[PDB]
Design an enzyme around this catalytic site. Structure first.
Site, PDB file in Angstrom:
ATOM      1  N   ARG A  18      10.600   7.026   0.968  1.00 23.97           N
ATOM      2  CA  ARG A  18       9.477   6.488   0.187  1.00 23.97           C
ATOM      3  C   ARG A  18       9.918   5.371  -0.751  1.00 23.97           C
ATOM      4  NH1 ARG A  18       4.980   8.223  -4.250  1.00 23.97           N
ATOM      5  NH2 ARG A  18       3.172   7.657  -2.925  1.00 23.97           N
ATOM      6  N   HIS A  37       4.857  10.483   6.921  1.00 21.58           N
ATOM      7  CA  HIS A  37       4.323  11.613   6.162  1.00 21.58           C
ATOM      8  C   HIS A  37       4.646  12.946   6.811  1.00 21.58           C
ATOM      9  CE1 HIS A  37       1.313   9.356   3.370  1.00 21.58           C
ATOM     10  NE2 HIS A  37       2.592   9.209   3.030  1.00 21.58           N
ATOM     11  N   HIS A  89       8.114   1.798  -0.898  1.00 20.87           N
ATOM     12  CA  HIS A  89       7.442   1.303  -2.078  1.00 20.87           C
ATOM     13  C   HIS A  89       8.104   0.045  -2.637  1.00 20.87           C
ATOM     14  CE1 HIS A  89       4.490   4.569  -3.598  1.00 20.87           C
ATOM     15  NE2 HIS A  89       4.328   4.297  -2.308  1.00 20.87           N
ATOM     16  N   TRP A 124       2.994  18.110   4.565  1.00 19.72           N
ATOM     17  CA  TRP A 124       2.185  17.797   5.733  1.00 19.72           C
ATOM     18  C   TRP A 124       2.545  18.628   6.943  1.00 19.72           C
ATOM     19  CZ3 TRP A 124       4.121  14.073   2.366  1.00 19.72           C
ATOM     20  CH2 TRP A 124       3.205  13.172   1.784  1.00 19.72           C
TER      21      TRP A 124
HETATM   22  C1  HEM Z   1      -2.322   4.402   3.066  1.00 24.14           C
HETATM   23  C2  HEM Z   1      -0.927   4.477   2.834  1.00 24.14           C
HETATM   24  C3  HEM Z   1      -0.246   5.524   2.135  1.00 24.14           C
HETATM   25  C4  HEM Z   1      -0.682   6.295   1.114  1.00 24.14           C
HETATM   26  C5  HEM Z   1      -2.000   6.253   0.364  1.00 24.14           C
HETATM   27  C6  HEM Z   1       0.366   7.189   0.758  1.00 24.14           C
HETATM   28  C7  HEM Z   1       0.327   8.153  -0.236  1.00 24.14           C
HETATM   29  C8  HEM Z   1       1.326   9.071  -0.544  1.00 24.14           C
HETATM   30  C9  HEM Z   1       1.218  10.042  -1.607  1.00 24.14           C
HETATM   31  C10 HEM Z   1       0.035  10.257  -2.524  1.00 24.14           C
HETATM   32  C11 HEM Z   1       2.412  10.719  -1.574  1.00 24.14           C
HETATM   33  C12 HEM Z   1       2.815  11.902  -2.405  1.00 24.14           C
HETATM   34  C13 HEM Z   1       3.679  11.424  -3.595  1.00 24.14           C
HETATM   35  C14 HEM Z   1       4.065  12.672  -4.383  1.00 24.14           C
HETATM   36  O1  HEM Z   1       3.158  13.385  -4.934  1.00 24.14           O
HETATM   37  O2  HEM Z   1       5.290  12.908  -4.439  1.00 24.14           O
HETATM   38  C15 HEM Z   1       3.237  10.187  -0.531  1.00 24.14           C
HETATM   39  C16 HEM Z   1       4.487  10.647  -0.193  1.00 24.14           C
HETATM   40  C17 HEM Z   1       5.305  10.073   0.781  1.00 24.14           C
HETATM   41  N1  HEM Z   1       4.997   8.928   1.496  1.00 24.14           N
HETATM   42 FE1  HEM Z   1       3.259   7.951   1.534  1.00 24.14          FE
HETATM   43  N2  HEM Z   1       1.487   6.960   1.561  1.00 24.14           N
HETATM   44  C18 HEM Z   1       1.136   5.925   2.400  1.00 24.14           C
HETATM   45  C19 HEM Z   1       1.995   5.325   3.297  1.00 24.14           C
HETATM   46  C20 HEM Z   1       3.349   5.639   3.527  1.00 24.14           C
HETATM   47  C21 HEM Z   1       4.250   4.897   4.345  1.00 24.14           C
HETATM   48  C22 HEM Z   1       3.828   3.608   5.025  1.00 24.14           C
HETATM   49  C23 HEM Z   1       5.463   5.516   4.291  1.00 24.14           C
HETATM   50  C24 HEM Z   1       6.747   5.101   4.802  1.00 24.14           C
HETATM   51  C25 HEM Z   1       6.918   4.574   6.081  1.00 24.14           C
HETATM   52  C26 HEM Z   1       5.303   6.646   3.424  1.00 24.14           C
HETATM   53  C27 HEM Z   1       6.264   7.583   3.130  1.00 24.14           C
HETATM   54  C28 HEM Z   1       6.120   8.683   2.268  1.00 24.14           C
HETATM   55  C29 HEM Z   1       7.088   9.740   2.100  1.00 24.14           C
HETATM   56  C30 HEM Z   1       8.384   9.810   2.898  1.00 24.14           C
HETATM   57  C31 HEM Z   1       6.564  10.610   1.204  1.00 24.14           C
HETATM   58  C32 HEM Z   1       7.161  11.887   0.649  1.00 24.14           C
HETATM   59  C33 HEM Z   1       7.926  11.627  -0.646  1.00 24.14           C
HETATM   60  C34 HEM Z   1       8.585  12.874  -1.211  1.00 24.14           C
HETATM   61  O3  HEM Z   1       8.591  13.973  -0.615  1.00 24.14           O
HETATM   62  O4  HEM Z   1       9.159  12.754  -2.336  1.00 24.14           O
HETATM   63  N3  HEM Z   1       3.990   6.721   2.927  1.00 24.14           N
HETATM   64  N4  HEM Z   1       2.552   9.147   0.089  1.00 24.14           N
END
Ligand code: HEM
Length: 291
Positions: A45, A172, A49, A188
């Protein structure tokens, strides 16, 4: 502005494989983080970001300048929790002070995907740190409470098409939402530190219920204990996205290949690679090295 990739002086593939390896060894060692999820997901992430602030219209933001190191960006509400990935990378940067910040943030994501048994992601060096005033403002990363039209329009700014968006969202599978971070809670799926196509399978095969979480936000929940954000669920509400979700749910290799391309692209938006730059590097995993 044009951001030309500039190879860290005198460095070559072996230098970056050493950085890869140090990241990978720390990923293995520091296994307790996040209730034993480990740092893989938050490093992916972080890479996203730090890259996803890019605006194709004027080449602002993006991975090149490593601007997450400045307070405006590390304190973006959208980035809550990523400080854990940054702190992880700190001893890596201390050991290898020659690597640029953008190169290290992006390499962290590559290394995490690969060490989690994901596809190979070719990676190019040459990001150069840029000054504090080049840090993009907050608000360029996406909201999760929106629909498919939002998602599609959002990702146009990153020059991503429908297939690239659905592929990227497969990340995700990894990690989880954390209520105090994003206002969403839950993983997820089951395999959340191994890179697979589970995100797509769960979208199609779980029985999802639209519920409110304890932050009063709506999310989709299954009896297995999994969740989807509204933007995740939009991928099966929109018929164009749905077709692609089904494709990836039914072809792990295709998902791997398309993710790899899209993720490299994400990590490289905004960067101009000279014609005589090195070819992209494909790092060996620790496992492939016998380490
Ligand atoms: C419409 C696009 C996206 C939205 C709205 C979104 C939203 C989110 C949200 C709300 C979280 C949870 C953050 C938390 O509470 O720790 C998250 C986690 C994460 N996202 Fe996304 N995301 C999007 C796209 C992506 C993309 C494009 C990737 C990478 C290729 C990605 C990778 C991750 C990963 C790996 C996590 C888990 C982080 C953790 O466990 O600490 N996301 N995302």
């Amino acid at each position: 502005l044009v951001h030309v990739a500039s190879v860290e002086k005198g460095r070559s593939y072996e230098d970056f494989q050493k950085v890869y390896n140090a990241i990978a060894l720390k990923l293995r060692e520091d296994d307790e983080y996040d209730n034993y999820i480990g740092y893989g997901p938050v490093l992916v992430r972080l890479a996203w970001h730090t890259s996803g602030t890019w605006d194709k219209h004027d080449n602002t933001g993006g991975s090149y300048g490593g601007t997450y190191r400045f307070k405006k960006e590390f304190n973006d509400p959208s980035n809550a929790g990523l400080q854990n990935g940054f702190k992880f990378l700190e001893p890596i940067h201390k050991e290898f002070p020659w690597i640029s910040s953008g190169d290290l943030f992006s390499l962290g994501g590559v290394t995490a995907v690969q060490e989690m048994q994901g596809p190979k992601i070719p990676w190019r060096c040459g990001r150069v740190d840029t000054p504090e005033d080049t840090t993009p403002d907050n608000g360029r990363l996406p909201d999760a409470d929106k629909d498919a039209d939002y998602v599609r329009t959002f990702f146009q700014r990153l020059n991503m098409n429908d297939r690239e968006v659905v592929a990227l969202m497969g990340a995700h599978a990894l990690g989880k939402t954390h209520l105090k971070r994003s206002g969403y809670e839950g993983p997820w799926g089951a395999a959340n530190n191994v890179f697979t196509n589970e995100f797509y399978l769960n979208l199609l095969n779980e029985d999802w219920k639209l519920e409110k979480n304890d932050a009063n936000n709506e999310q989709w929940d299954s009896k297995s204990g999994y969740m989807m954000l509204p933007t995740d669920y939009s991928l099966i509400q929109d018929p164009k996205y749905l077709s692609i979700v089904k494709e990836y749910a039914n072809d792990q290799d295709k998902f791997f290949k398309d993710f790899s391309k899209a993720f490299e692209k994400l990590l490289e938006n905004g960067i101009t690679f000279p014609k005589d730059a090195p070819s992209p590097f494909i790092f060996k995993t620790l496992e492939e090295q016998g380490l």
